[PDB]
Amino acid sequence: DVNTLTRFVMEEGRKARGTGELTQLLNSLCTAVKAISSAVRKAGIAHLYGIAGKLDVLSNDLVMNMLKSSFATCVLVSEEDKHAIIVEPEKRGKYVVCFDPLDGSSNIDCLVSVGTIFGIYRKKSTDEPSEKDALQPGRNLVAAGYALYGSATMLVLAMDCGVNCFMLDPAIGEFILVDKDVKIKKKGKIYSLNEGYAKDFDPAVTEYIQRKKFPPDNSAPYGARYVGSMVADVHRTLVYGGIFLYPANKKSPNGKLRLLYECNPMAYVMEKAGGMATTGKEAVLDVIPTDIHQRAPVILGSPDDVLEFLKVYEKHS
Amino acid sequence: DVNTLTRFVMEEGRKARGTGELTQLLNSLCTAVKAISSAVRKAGIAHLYGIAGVKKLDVLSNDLVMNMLKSSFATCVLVSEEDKHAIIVEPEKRGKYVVCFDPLDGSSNIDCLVSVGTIFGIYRKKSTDEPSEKDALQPGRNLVAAGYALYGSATMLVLAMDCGVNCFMLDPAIGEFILVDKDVKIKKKGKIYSLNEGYAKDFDPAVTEYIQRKKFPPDNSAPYGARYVGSMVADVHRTLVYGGIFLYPANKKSPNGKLRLLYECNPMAYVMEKAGGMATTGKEAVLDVIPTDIHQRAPVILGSPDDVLEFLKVYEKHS
Amino acid sequence: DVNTLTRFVMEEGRKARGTGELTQLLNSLCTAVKAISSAVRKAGIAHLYGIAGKLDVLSNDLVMNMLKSSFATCVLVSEEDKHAIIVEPEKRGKYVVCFDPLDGSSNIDCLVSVGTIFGIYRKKSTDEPSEKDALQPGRNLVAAGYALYGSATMLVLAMDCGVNCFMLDPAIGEFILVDKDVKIKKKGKIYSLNEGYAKDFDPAVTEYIQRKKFPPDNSAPYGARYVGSMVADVHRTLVYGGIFLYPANKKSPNGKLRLLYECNPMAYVMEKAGGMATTGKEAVLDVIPTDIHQRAPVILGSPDDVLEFLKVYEKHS
Amino acid sequence: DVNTLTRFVMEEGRKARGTGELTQLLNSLCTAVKAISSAVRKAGIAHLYGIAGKKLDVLSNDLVMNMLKSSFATCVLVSEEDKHAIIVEPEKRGKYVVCFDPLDGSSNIDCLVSVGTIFGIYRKKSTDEPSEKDALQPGRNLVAAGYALYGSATMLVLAMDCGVNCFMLDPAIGEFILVDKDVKIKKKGKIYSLNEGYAKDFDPAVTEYIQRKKFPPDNSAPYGARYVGSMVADVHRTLVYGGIFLYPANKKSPNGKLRLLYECNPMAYVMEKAGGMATTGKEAVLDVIPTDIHQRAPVILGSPDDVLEFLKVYEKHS
Ligand SMILES: O=C(Nc1ncc(Br)s1)NS(=O)(=O)c1ccc(-c2ccon2)s1
Ligand SMILES: O=C(Nc1ncc(Br)s1)NS(=O)(=O)c1ccc(-c2ccon2)s1
Ligand SMILES: O=C(Nc1ncc(Br)s1)NS(=O)(=O)c1ccc(-c2ccon2)s1
Ligand SMILES: O=C(Nc1ncc(Br)s1)NS(=O)(=O)c1ccc(-c2ccon2)s1
């Protein structure tokens, strides 16, 4: 039987006897995602070029405005905004959302895949909402996932019930459930990182990559793929298995990717799908943040691959 | 003044006072590309999943391109990645052009929603013989027009002709390709290199050395960034827009490369050269290779001219 | 604040503290409506005409399948089906839906406006579900309305809270709330019926229409509009006021339109908008049906107009 | 074999060995129609209602005006929306004159009634500097005419010397697909279409003609009645199903109500190319010689047997 994102979430929500607030939040976010997809695919671009005589900004505005008007949120953290946005009292609900509204858009000029990343926390205190309510470890996530605007648009949603993938059908503007309760391959054959920084790699990363090209057990060398857009590389990792790395380098000693709205949501999806996500020293989801924009190293993907990296890492202490 | 692909092509065609056959071919191709784009973006996928109670995209894309080109009355020989032999257009529909195309390049990994694309190269039939597979065995130098549609974050058609390279964005709201970048030229030198480094164990020594220079520059310059989507159209388009170098080179296990000369390497080589870039096998310009088999493979290193020249110096150093 | 059909319904649902089942039904119906709209606008018709080398049945299948899979329905009555459809046990919910999946489609060759009409009842007995569960007077309606596939696609939804109109934005597949709590004009200036059959008119219809064209006082004659598609004519009546008639005559003593999925839903929309809908003898919503396909006369619209018709009607009684 | 509007027109153009200018005009017009369709169907209306925190008839006029200007195929443009003829600037001037109604019927678009775009295309006949007078040609001089109907689906009906062809807009690919070729209207229909609200003002010929449709003297079946009130919708039904459409003069409209240049003439041309008829009562619509670009005309059009029967009634009343 066919299923849609809205109906699936309503069915899980009624099952759990929740109040509906998370459903209202996720439905609003889905509306924003469909609007981002439409603009990213350049619907209406003829009007900008004069037929009748910004994208990261628009995407941020869509997510902010839909989440605010959902009555489900109180604190909103975005890659685009220096400080947390505090929802005004009349529109406040109980959830905190950290999101990247158009990840990868710095290279959208070459039509690279881009995406929207989000993580949802429940506000724990009766204190007035503030930026500090977003300073939770990824372990506290109630839901996370991403929309990938690739060759097609897909929303990947991870909750306690598992990871589910929904294809946007542009003919009807509906997210169709196409992959249920997805689990990542135990071990893959693709590794994904920017080898342009080889001169800056930690010795553990250098050794691990060497194992991928010259395997010690005489297995076949891994293929390499690096789109340079996190959502595209991570989604490929989920679908085909393998490993994605953005480790520390000379320009980024704490990594480059952002803990709150890049690393934690992807770590949560990976773990809910039976994969792993590590900084090298600990699970991404266990890092306790002190800055809503702080960076974190991330190595994620199939469990055997991440475990193999951790073995190399531990060898170098 | 706003411009669309159709209007751009009709105006160039009236300027050149051609008969309209190439315009008819290109318009038919654009219609196929719009239909491929619609399917790649999964319009109607709800019906496959039972909303009311089927082909793979690469098969459907081949059918779309084949049928629109046959019915254009502009073509006589059609070479597709999908078909072992050239398709000969039936007599009542024959025009003067030969088209080699890859209808959905990169589709092997479309399960992960990677960018995919359509690549095409257009020749004029040279012989007065009955049309045959031999009419497709022309060097890339003979191309009349070539380019690609990239189904990425948006859909773009890049079209190269004698007048240069022009980029048209598909507006899905109205099904028109809007001219957005005119007479584009590639950067003289870039800062990105693009190849599958997972197979480093098999690299030719010149490739190994060149990549080492990009990561560990001898002149204290900044190391290049690396990008490899693994879908030729996505990687080549990034090379065009940002500059830099793309490599799918020969090695000991693959002395002729992996990519296909007629409908992958030649069209991209032609786009690159019309944009002021370069495209080499290592031994010669891709566009100068004279094919003997419509599916033969060719190595390709292409992109910003300084980057390709630097690669060629390393290649020559290793003989 | 922007509002969508889904958000509007969930909000009314949490206000009313319902279980969510009616929201699940309405979300499912909206998905079917978007899919009908897409097919009605001929998305994909190029494939039927050979680019790569029924509509009423499809519309019925979309509504049937989306409602069955909603888990909110137990008995489904459609203009397209001779008998009531009984939902299989594992998918049964508490609601009964009567619908016309593509009203007006008999003339769709000329691209006339078409529409989907629906009325939703609560199943009243604990008996095994059967056709009798749909034999409720329109007074028992929980929700009713229609989708108009006209120059744009609009969903008009009537419930206890009133009548609200939602415009389908095809770029994102969301029904946008554009007219809230709408009320019909007290008196209009348009009459709508097929005057070609004047020779069969009941004498009261003949006189009433004659008064619209040749007013006895010095008022302006009414304009005439008759699309011949019920959803188009009723929606114009709602928007501009006036009167719509498909009355009884000697050859058709029960009228021609169908009570369960044409007359009752429109009568309910009209009454919730402050309009009226009569058979001539009684309110449409008070007719107790004995046949799921039974016909009913209907005269509906602005109350002053319907009351004036009833004055002429009794005069010939 | 599948066929599209662009491909059909290029093929007819190469057959006739024209210069391509009319094709350039028609392709530009079709681009405008697709953009009007997108806006009429309310794509993007969520942004207008604040999802991120022109009137349709004005936008439609701007789309057609701008695409026709930039086509280099036109010199004088007459629109329902513009008091005076628009003169194309010298560097963009081509040889054709276009009269159009960019969004016919939009006064009631509040009720989502079908709306449409109507157009008629002339060759500029005079060598004078382009002016409003270049649009004052009788409909007989039309080179091409037709309409887009934004109804349950979007359809473009194009009439030329080769006949009338109907193209369905496939929104999935933004392409007009040829679905009805060389269309001909039924010799006689069973539907009449007019606003009977003006019955008190009808001239005796119309009153009698309508009486014949309801109470046939030969005891045949009465005609059904349909009146959307949007000309493109009513005329297209007449083309597809046959029958007759009337908008005669009345007291509010003593010279008729519909506009000669960009409503009556294009529809009259489509009807005649489809084997139908279009009369003012006194003469063929296409034979009226206009003096004012916004002048009105009575019109009775449709199946030839139906219009001929009307004209017989008209003659009887002198
Ligand atoms: O939505 C509701 N209740 C409702 N009542 C009526 C309607 Br209709 S939906 N509750 S909820 O908290 O928002 C929620 C949504 C999803 C949840 C989930 C997913 C996996 O595990 N739990 S929990
Ligand atoms: O299209 C025509 N003639 C026409 N007549 C009327 C119309 Br309308 S189009 N000829 S052509 O050969 O097909 C051609 C198309 C594009 C060309 C080109 C691009 C760059 O440099 N030359 S040449
Ligand atoms: O939807 C719910 N409950 C929910 N809880 C959480 C979420 Br999220 S939805 N209940 S309901 O019965 O389906 C219903 C829907 C609309 C209703 C209505 C409209 C006007 O007057 N009443 S009543
Ligand atoms: O388009 C051309 N020539 C071309 N050459 C190459 C290309 Br490609 S198009 N000429 S034309 O005048 O514009 C014209 C268009 C349609 C016409 C017609 C329809 C019915 O009867 N005549 S005549």
Any long-range contacts for C161-164 (C-beta under 8 Å, 24+ apart)?
C161/C12, C162/C272, C162/C273, C163/C238, C163/C269, C163/C272, C163/C273, C164/C8
Instruction: Give yes or no for residue A18 CB within 6 A of ligand 1.
Output: yes
* DSSP-assigned beta bridge partners for residue C73: C92, C95
For A255, phi then psi, to 5°, come to: 80, 180
Same domain, C187 and C173: no
Non-local CB neighbours of C171 within 8 Å, separated by 6+ positions: A35, A38, A43, A44, A173, B173, D43, D44, D46
The crossing angle, in degrees rounded to 10, of helices C5-16 and C21-40 is 170
Question: Which of C2, C20, C174 comes nearest A34 by C-beta?
Answer: C174
Please compute, for residue C125, the number of CA atoms within 13 A of its CA located in the half-sphere on the CB side: 11
Q: Are strands B225-226 and B245-248 parallel, antiparallel or unpaired?
A: unpaired
Kindly state the greatest CA–CA separation across chain D: 66
What span, in angstroms and rounded, lies between the C-alpha atoms of B206 and C178? 65
Tell me the C-alpha distance between C88 and C71, whole Å: 10
- Tell me how far apart the alpha carbons of residues A285 and D145 are, in angstroms, rounded to a whole number: 67
Quick one: CA dihedral B123, B129, B133, B138, positive or negative? negative
For residue D93, count CB atoms less than 10 angstroms from its CB and return exposed for 0-12, middle for 13-18, buried for 19 or more.
middle
Do the chains contact at D51 and A43, CB–CB below 8 Å? Answer: no
Contact present, D149 and D236 (Cβ < 8 Å): yes
* Residue at which a domain ends, from A155, A181, A207: A181
Would you say A88 is a known binding-site residue?
Answer: no
Q: Is the CB of A196 under 6 A from ligand 1?
A: no
- Rounded CA-CA distance C109/B6 in Å is 31
Map residue D149 onto helix, strand or coil. Answer: strand
CATH code of the domain covering residue C30: 3.30.540.10
User: How far is residue D90 from each of residues A50, B4, D69, D70, D130, measured CA to CA in Å?
Assistant: 20, 22, 10, 12, 10
How many Cβ atoms sit within 10 Å of the Cβ of residue C123? Answer: 18
Given A134, A166, A181, the domain boundary residue is A181
CB of A19 closer than 6 angstroms to any ligand 1 atom: yes
Q: Which residue, of C154, C181, C208, is where some domain finishes?
A: C181
Q: Cβ D152–C198 below 8 Å, yes or no?
A: no
Q: How far is it, in rounded angstroms, from Cα C121 to Cα C99? A: 11
Cα–Cα distance for residue pair B253/C4, rounded to 1 Å: 59
SS3 label, residue B143 = coil
CA separation for the pair C4, A34 (Å, rounded)? 13
C42: nearest CB among D46, D168, D237 = D168
Kindly state the tokens that stand for B173: 């709201």
Query: Rounded to the nearest 5°, which phi and psi values hold at B252?
Result: -65, -40
Question: Percent helix, strand and coil across chain B, each rounded to 5?
Answer: 40, 25, 35
Same structural domain, A95 and A75: yes
Find the DSSP H helices in B164-264: 205-215, 232-242
Nearest to D49 among C2, C195, C214 (CB): C2
Bridge-partner residues for D97, per DSSP? Answer: D76, D122
| Pairing, β C298-301 against β D154-160 | unpaired
* A270 and A304 both lie in a single domain: yes
Q: Pick from D158, D310, D293, D304: which is nearest to D247 by CA?
A: D310
- Asked if D168 and D264 sit in the same domain, the reply is no
To test the contact with chain A by mutation, choose from B153, B177, B196, B242 the residue with the greatest count of A C-beta atoms within 10 A, namely: B153
* Total structural domains within chain A: 2
Do A140 and A203 sit in the same domain of this protein?
no
Portion 66-85 of C in contact with B at CB < 8 A? 66
Residues B217 and B305 in one domain: yes
Amino acid at B263: Y
User: 3-state SS string over B253-288?
Assistant: CCCCCCCEHHHHHHHHHHHHHHCCCEEECCCCEHHH
CB B279 within 8 A of CB B287: yes
Contact state of D35 with B4 under an 8 Å Cβ cutoff:
no
Q: Which atom of ligand 3 is nearest to the CA of C24?
A: 13
CB–CB contact C224 D197 (8 Å): yes
Cα–Cα distance measured from residue A16 to residue A180, given in angstroms and rounded to the nearest whole number: 18
CA dist A6 and C161 (Å) reads 23
| Residues D2 and D56 both lie in one domain | yes
Q: Which residues, 6 or more positions from A292, have their beta carbon under 8 angstroms from its beta carbon? A: A77, A84, A98, A131, A134, A135, A260
Mutate to test the interface with A, among B112, B151, B174 (most CBs of A within 10 A): B112
Residues 6+ apart with CB under 8 A from D256: D247, D248, D249, D264, D280, D296, D297, D298, D299
B183 Cβ closer than 6 Å to some ligand 2 atom: no
Q: Which helix (H) or strand (E) holds C36?
A: helix C21-40
Name residue A255's beta-bridge partners.
A253
Task: Give the neighbor-by-neighbor strand order of the sheet with A174-179.
Answer: A85-86, A73-78, A92-103, A114-122, A143-149, A153-159, A162-169, A174-179
Task: Check CB contact of D172 with chain A, cutoff 8 Å.
Answer: yes
Query: Residue B276: which region, alpha, beta or left (left: phi > 0; alpha: psi -120 to 50)?
Result: left
Contact present, D27 and B9 (Cβ < 8 Å):
no
Please indicate, yes or no, whether residues C155 and C258 belong to a single structural domain of this protein.
no
Residue D86 to residue D65: CA distance in whole angstroms: 9
A243 neighbors A306 (Cβ within 8 angstroms): yes
Task: Find residue C154's DSSP bridge partners.
Answer: C148, C167
Resolution limit in angstroms? 2.1
State the smallest CA–CA distance between residue D212 and chain C in angstroms. Answer: 10
Residue C246 marked ligand-binding: yes
- Cα separation, A308 vs A166, whole angstroms: 31
**Are B242 and B101 members of one domain?**
no
Do C73 and C216 reside in the same domain of the chain? no
Task: Please tell me if residue C34 touches chain A, with a CB cutoff of 8 Å.
Answer: yes
Residue with tokens 């080699």: B100
Please, which residues 213-232 of chain B have a Cβ atom closer than 8 Å to chain A?
A: 214-216, 223-230
Q: Do B25 and B9 form a contact (C-beta atoms < 8 A)?
A: no
Q: How far apart are CA C157 and CA C150, in angstroms?
A: 16
Return the closest-CA partner of residue C227 out of C194, C203, C272. Answer: C194
Cα D218 from chain centroid (whole Å) = 34
d(CA B121, CA B113): 25
Q: Name every residue whose Cβ is closer than 8 Å to that of residue B9 and which is 6 or more positions away in sequence.
A: B22, B23, B26, B27
Residues of chain A in contact with residue B180, where contact means CB-CB under 8 angstroms, are 45, 49
How far apart CA D202 and CA D196 sit, in angstroms, is 9
Instruction: State how far the alpha carbon of A29 is from the alpha carbons of A102, A117, C7, C172, in Å.
Output: 13, 11, 12, 12
Spatial strand order in the sheet of B225-226: B225-226, B192-194, B245-248, B300-303, B278-280
Enclosing H/E stretch for B117: strand B116-124
Nearest CA to ligand 3 atom 12: C18
Token pair belonging to D283: 């003469």
CATH code where residue D223 lies: 3.40.190.80
Residue B231 contacts residue B102 (beta carbons within 8 Å): no
| DSSP assigned state of D93 | B
Structure tokens at D294: 């916004």
Q: Are residues D219 and D141 in the same domain?
A: no
Both tokens assigned to C73: 């329905």
List the structure tokens of D7: 């491909």
Contact present, B300 and B248 (Cβ < 8 Å): yes
Go through chain A and tell me how many residues it has.
317
Contacts of D37 in chain B (CB under 8 A): 174
Q: Which amino acid is at D195?
A: N
Tokens coding A117: 């990343």
Neighbours of C189 (CB within 10 A): 18
Sign of CA dihedral B197, A210, A297, A165: positive
| Beta-carbon contacts of residue D102 (< 8 Å; ≥ 6 apart) | D36, D57, D60, D61, D63, D64, D79, D80, D81, D117
Q: Are strands A223-224 and A190-192 parallel, antiparallel or unpaired?
A: parallel
C61 in A contact zone (CB under 8 Å): no
Distance of alpha carbon C306 from alpha carbon B122, whole angstroms? 69
Q: Measured from the CB, is residue C44 less than 6 Å from ligand 1?
A: no
Q: Quickly list DSSP for A250-276.
A: SS-BTBSSBIIIIIHHHHHHHHHTT-E
Paired tokens of C223: 């304009």
Please check whether residue D89 is in contact with residue D124, taking contact to mean a CB–CB distance below 8 angstroms.
no
Question: CB atoms < 10 A from the CB of D30, how many?
Answer: 26
Nearest neighbour of B52 by CB, restricted to C50, C51, C62: C62
Residue D232 contacts residue D149 (beta carbons within 8 Å): yes
Q: Which residue in this structure is represented by tokens 């992807």?
A: A266
> Obtained via which technique?
X-ray
- Quick check: B59 contacting A, CB < 8 Å? no
Sequence-distant (6+) residues with CB within 8 A of C117 are C99, C100, C103, C145, C146, C230, C231, C261, C262, C265, C266
Element (H, E) at D159: strand D154-160
Same domain, D308 and D224: yes
Residue matched to tokens 């066929």: D3
**Contact between residue B311 and residue B212 where contact means Cβ atoms under 8 Å apart:** no
Residue B72: closest C-alpha in chain D = D7
Provide the residue range defining the domain that includes B39: 1-183
- Give the residue, by CA position, lying nearest to ligand 2 atom 8: D20
| Residue in this structure with the two tokens 């203009």, named with its chain if needed | C79
